[PDB]
């Protein structure tokens, strides 16, 4: 079945724990003084960069994703990767130790990454803590962030199709959520994350504006391109 499909791809693609990189982690109480520098925001780039790599991956493994056209595979892998991102790093991190895990497998604390991510990753941790205490489980999760991507797009090519795709996801989500229990929310308090997740993009891209001024080093150019989709 479907959810199966969902499962493996969400599974077969994030971090392993088993296959986290702990090389750069530094456990700190110390709050750093300091304008980020020139090493921080190389950092902060190659992190998103990496994620995009990881989460361009698991779309193919979305069943049907692949199947819609190279432009709208394109327009909701483009729409959908700031949230994406910050989705699969809330869910995946453990705040209650001050731990960031990235898609890459990088292990980066709170405290580290003030530094390139500002504030930002505060409302990260919290929005974080805010996912862990309602327990959504794997599969549920799996569904959660098919959704974030297959969703109507301005400029879609062919809504219609992405719309069906859509369609068996939520249902597929629904069918899960009704074995867990006795359609009725539960869905969503779930469901009410998806809008939380939006604000948090807002001050990523704030965060991203506030370096395309600092101008130090470049962006890249994939992230430029979906910072300039604004």
């Given at each position: 079945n479907l959810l199966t499909s969902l499962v493996r791809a969400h599974l077969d693609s994030g971090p392993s724990t088993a296959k986290l990189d702990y090389s750069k982690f530094q456990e700190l109480v110390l709050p750093h003084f300091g304008k980020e520098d020139a090493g921080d925001v190389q950092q902060f780039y190659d992190l998103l960069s990496g994620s995009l790599e990881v989460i361009r991956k698991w779309a193919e493994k979305i069943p049907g994703f692949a199947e819609l056209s190279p432009a709208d595979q394109d327009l909701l892998l483009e729409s959908a990767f700031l949230e994406?991102?910050?989705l699969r790093l809330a869910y995946r991190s453990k705040p209650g130790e001050g731990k960031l895990i990235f898609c890459?497998?990088?292990v980066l604390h709170r405290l580290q990454c003030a530094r390139g991510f500002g504030d930002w990753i505060d409302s990260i941790l919290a929005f974080s803590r805010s996912l862990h205490?309602?327990?959504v489980?794997?599969?549920a999760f799996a569904c959660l962030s098919a959704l974030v991507l297959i969703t109507d797009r301005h400029g879609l090519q062919e809504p219609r199709r992405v719309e069906e795709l859509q369609n068996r996801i939520a249902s597929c989500l629904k069918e899960h959520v009704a074995a867990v229990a006795g359609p009725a929310s539960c869905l969503s308090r779930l469901l009410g994350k998806l809008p939380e997740l939006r604000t948090l993009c807002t001050q990523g891209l704030q965060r991203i504006f506030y370096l395309k001024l600092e101008d130090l080093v470049p962006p890249?150019?994939?992230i430029?391109?979906?910072f300039?989709?604004?």
């Open positions: 994406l991102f910050i890459s497998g990088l205490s309602l327990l489980d794997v599969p890249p150019p994939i430029d391109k979906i300039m989709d604004t």
